[PDB]
């Protein structure tokens, strides 16, 4: 019955025993576990949102799909990252059947789980995604920016260091042809300029305006770093 979502309720109330009972009942009647409420959430979405790793494991092992989309096109993985929940992300990645979970999934905004994680600057979720195969250079359709460029624009030295550590292309360019270094240089983000240059950033790379990171240097201190 419409407005009847007993499994959704059991999840939000954190009642694992009830969830188990209901999962058994659903399976006996051929009912899908990926049933939507009026917010377009499945019970699995709710398990991640509530931060219940044990429930996530039960549901996924029982056949709930990690790829079912919510209202904003978020997969379970996307939701674990926006909720800064490494344990739920771990539960999902460990429980999913081989070949059923794709970390390159794009939400309606166009972002991967990695983009979302970097934006929260949660080091734990970023690390785990990267260890499990997430494409570190993936570019979302909206901005054409890699996670590294996102990190530089957010002025997060931690994320910049973490991504470079994991093999990120330091010379990736946006639609306009600007790189991470153009951004750091133009804004005078000294610690970032130092980190990018030592990691191999190309200071001669031209954008669509024909500008190089050297030409947009905000101050003499930046120029000094760029030139060594």
From Swiss-Prot:
Q: Which GO CC terms are listed, alphabetically?
A: Bcl3-Bcl10 complex; Bcl3/NF-kappaB2 complex; ciliary basal body; cytoplasm; cytosol; intracellular membrane-bounded organelle; midbody; nucleoplasm
> Which residues does UniProt call coiled coil?
none
Q: Where are the ANK repeats?
A: 2-31, 39-68, 72-103, 109-138, 143-172, 176-205, 206-228
Instruction: Indicate the principal place this protein occupies in or around the cell.
Output: nucleus
Molecular functions per Gene Ontology: DNA-binding transcription factor binding; histone deacetylase binding; protein-macromolecule adaptor activity; transcription coactivator activity; transcription corepressor activity
What modifications follow translation? Answer: Polyubiquitinated. Ubiquitination via 'Lys-63'-linked ubiquitin chains is required for nuclear accumulation. Deubiquitinated by CYLD, which acts on 'Lys-63'-linked ubiquitin chains. Deubiquitination by CYLD prevents nuclear accumulation.
Q: Which GO terms describe its biological process?
A: antimicrobial humoral response; canonical NF-kappaB signal transduction; defense response to bacterium; defense response to protozoan; DNA damage response; DNA damage response, signal transduction by p53 class mediator; extracellular matrix organization; follicular dendritic cell differentiation
Q: Where in or outside the cell is it found? A: Nucleus; Cytoplasm; Cytoplasm, Perinuclear region
> What are the protein's UniProt keywords?
Activator, ANK repeat, Chromosomal rearrangement, Cytoplasm, Nucleus, Phosphoprotein, Proto-oncogene, Repeat, Transcription, Transcription regulation, Ubl conjugation
> How does the record describe its quaternary structure?
Component of a complex consisting of the NF-kappa-B p52-p52 homodimer and BCL3. Component of a complex consisting of the NF-kappa-B p50-p50 homodimer and BCL3. Interacts with N4BP2, COPS5 and PIR. Interacts with CYLD.
- Function field: Contributes to the regulation of transcriptional activation of NF-kappa-B target genes. In the cytoplasm, inhibits the nuclear translocation of the NF-kappa-B p50 subunit. In the nucleus, acts as transcriptional activator that promotes transcription of NF-kappa-B target genes. Contributes to the regulation of cell proliferation.
Q: Which disease is it linked to?
A: A chromosomal aberration involving BCL3 may be a cause of B-cell chronic lymphocytic leukemia (B-CLL). Translocation t(14;19)(q32;q13.1) with immunoglobulin gene regions.
Designated name of the protein: B-cell lymphoma 3 protein
Source species, please?
Homo sapiens
Q: What stretch of the complete protein does the chain hold?
A: 133 to 360 of 454
């Amino acid at each position: 019955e419409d407005g009847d979502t007993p499994l959704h309720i059991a999840v939000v109330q954190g009642n694992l025993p009830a969830v188990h009972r209901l999962v058994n009942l659903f399976q006996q009647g051929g009912r899908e576990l990926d049933i939507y409420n009026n917010l377009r959430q499945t019970p699995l979405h709710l398990a991640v949102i509530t931060t219940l790793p044990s429930v996530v494991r039960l549901l996924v092992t029982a056949g709930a799909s990690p790829m079912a989309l919510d209202r904003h096109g978020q997969t379970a993985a996307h939701l674990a990252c926006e909720h800064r929940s490494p344990t739920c992300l771990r539960a999902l990645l460990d429980s999913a059947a081989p070949g059923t979970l794709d970390l390159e999934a794009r939400n309606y905004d166009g972002l991967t789980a990695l983009h979302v994680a970097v934006n929260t600057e949660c080091q734990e979720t970023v690390q785990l995604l990267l260890e499990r195969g997430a494409d570190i250079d993936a570019v979302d359709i909206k901005s054409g920016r890699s996670p590294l460029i996102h990190a530089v624009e957010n002025n997060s030295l931690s994320m910049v260091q973490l991504l470079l550590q994991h093999g990120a292309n330091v010379n990736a360019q946006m639609y306009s042809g600007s790189s991470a270094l153009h951004s750091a240089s133009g804004r005078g983000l000294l610690p970032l300029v130092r980190t990018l240059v030592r990691s191999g950033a190309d200071s001669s790379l031209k954008n669509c305006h024909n500008d190089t990171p050297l030409m947009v240097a905000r101050s003499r201190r930046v120029i000094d770093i760029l030139r060594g």
